[PDB]
Write a protein that binds this ligand. Structure first.
Ligand SMILES: Nc1ncnc2c1ncn2[C@@H]1O[C@H](COP(=O)(O)OP(=O)(O)OP(O)(O)=S)[C@@H](O)[C@H]1O
Ligand SMILES: [Mg+2]
Lengths: 333, 56, 167
DNA sequence: ACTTGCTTAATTGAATTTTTTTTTTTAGGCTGACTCGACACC
DNA sequence: GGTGTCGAGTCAGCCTACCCCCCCCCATTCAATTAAGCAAGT
DNA sequence: CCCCCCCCCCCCCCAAAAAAAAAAACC
């Protein structure tokens, strides 16, 4: 008796809300396809595993932070390169004024279709982000350094002048405005941030990021990237040994980490990863310092084993297919 | 209230002068809103009393 | 809302006086922003109630009351910010204990010490030589057990500090 | 009977520095900028 | 025929009317220091 | 005895509401 009266009052209210605000304003969460999480590759297989859902989520905000020369720009360009290869449009907002277009081409970016902007102010940078988000025509936006998003008042002003929390306020306002626009357009926004030291602290770590506290809350993923060593061809340093910690994750379990090589002028070493994962999943046998695939000695030393996998495009397909099958915990589709 | 004050001033001003009686009105401040230029402080009971007052 | 409150006061002030009825309005605090003349703490509902009020009390929590670790109440301060029936700007300090209310015996200690009926050496409370406890809580706990001395100290404090007693 | 360490509570001090600017809800005038027709002159 | 220039018309943004009330502001936590009373040693 | 004719003028305001936000090593 009361059941029917409640179901009718509910049905009437739902009808009135959908009339006043629009069609999909309120609905049951189980029958809402908009809310399903879709992901894209990072151009690193170990990082796609660490993220738990096979890559970075569309319609969300991501933060990548780290020290100087850690690989923050190189990593965001490999994301763009991968996205372009699946026929997606990408934008680069270069607030640092430090992008080399020749190096971007060497990492596999289609330069001639990559939208670029070198804005004057933080406001202009973030108004271009909102304009491209509302359009529905851009799939990935990268904002290179939050640290270089200078408010207009600070550019007009003198060096030494105080602007209390003015960048932090700008970023707080930006997040509020963007979150909704990005979810509707299914657009991925990636923010790069720099590290700074906070003083008057003895608990926790003294490392901070720039641009205040809003971005920590709204980010669905946060990556801490670091250079942990060198890659040498005898004497010549030819690349960096890199580590990425997943510091925040809302689309899968956090605190996982990824290890890989960045080689100068190539990018992330995909086959270098595919060796290490093939080893861990018992598909490649490392008998001391001798890498072996089904008895056949593919080489000795990681570089020779990688060079062998490069020469055999069938054996690389085989191992990738198995590793993808096994380790990807939440496959999206 | 503005009308009642308007009518009272008309009636009282002449009766006070004849009898030589001092009449003191106390008023409270309110805040007039939708004013940018100047002082947003008003008093109560309309405009008549400003005109008929010999001292404010 | 400011208009409604302005209209309400006009109507109520006279009706309350005839009936001899006490009306108490509780108000919340809000922040005034921009170009501020004075303190940025405001109250809600416009400017009428400030004029019509015969008494205005500002109440504040100034600390915790702890039984070792367990927080068992609040230390409170009340400022008299407006008064038309006696002189203003006097203040009161008392304890609110959760589930009991205002700690009457705690006030009686503090008023006993002020009017020399109780002797306080460091943190040692003495009534006519006899030592009644160390610390305000043990002193209070004694006065709770000895209602003869409580009634005596109350009667003397009322005689001293309350100017005109009851009818 | 004289002196000292322990007890329990309450009191006071430091905690590196030092800093900003904005709205909706005006009304009516003044400045500068853009549009268009066309008339003088090479 | 085309470009500079005279002229009327229309539109977007700024600013100036304006005096200027305050009576002085919302407040905390850990730990070193002080001290009156009382049991233990002499 | 016999039979109507015609309008005139406004008056007064009332009330506030609300925060937002870090930035940086030094030997
Ligand atoms: N144009 C280039 N040619 C060769 N190597 C490069 C080039 N640009 C960057 N690298 C190297 O790639 C590695 C990572 O560089 P990035 O990806 O630019 O790092 P990053 O964190 O953006 O550092 P910033 O912005 O300069 S603090 C470093 O060892 C660089 O020296
Ligand atoms: Mg960079």
């Amino acid at each position: 008796a009361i059941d029917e009266n409640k179901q009718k009052a509910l049905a009437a209210a739902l009808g009135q809300i959908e009339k006043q605000f629009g069609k999909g304003s309120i609905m049951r969460l189980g029958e809402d396809r908009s809310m399903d999480v879709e992901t894209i590759s990072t151009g690193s297989l170990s990082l796609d595993i660490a993220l738990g859902a096979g890559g970075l989520p569309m319609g969300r905000i991501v933060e990548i932070y780290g020290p100087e020369s850690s690989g923050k720009t190189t990593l965001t360009l490999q994301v763009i390169a991968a996205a372009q290869r699946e026929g997606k449009t990408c934008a680069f907002i270069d607030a640092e004024h430090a992008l080399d277009p020749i190096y971007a081409r060497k990492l596999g970016v289609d330069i001639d279709n990559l939208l670029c902007s070198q804005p004057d102010t933080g406001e202009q940078a973030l108004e271009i982000c909102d304009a491209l988000a509302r359009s529905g025509a851009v799939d990935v936006i990268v904002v290179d350094s939050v640290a270089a998003l200078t408010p207009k008042a600070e550019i007009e002003g003198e060096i030494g002048d105080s602007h209390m929390g003015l960048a932090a306020r700008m970023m707080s306002q930006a997040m509020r405005k963007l979150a909704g626009n990005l979810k509707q357009s299914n657009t991925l926004l990636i923010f790069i941030n720099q590290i700074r030291m906070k003083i008057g602290v003895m608990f926790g770590n003294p490392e901070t990021t720039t641009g205040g506290n809003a971005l920590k809350f709204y980010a669905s993923v946060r990556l801490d990237i670091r250079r942990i060593g060198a890659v040498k061809e005898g004497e010549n340093v030819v690349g960096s040994e890199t580590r990425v910690k997943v510091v925040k994750n809302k689309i899968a379990a956090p605190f996982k980490q990824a290890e890989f090589q960045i080689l100068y002028g190539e990018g992330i070493n995909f086959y270098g990863e595919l060796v290490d994962l093939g080893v861990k999943e018992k598909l490649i046998e490392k008998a001391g310092a001798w890498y072996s695939y089904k008895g056949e000695k593919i080489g000795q030393g990681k570089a020779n084993a990688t060079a062998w996998l490069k020469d055999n495009p069938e054996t690389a397909k085989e191992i990738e297919k198995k590793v993808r099958e096994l380790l990807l915990s939440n496959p999206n589709s």
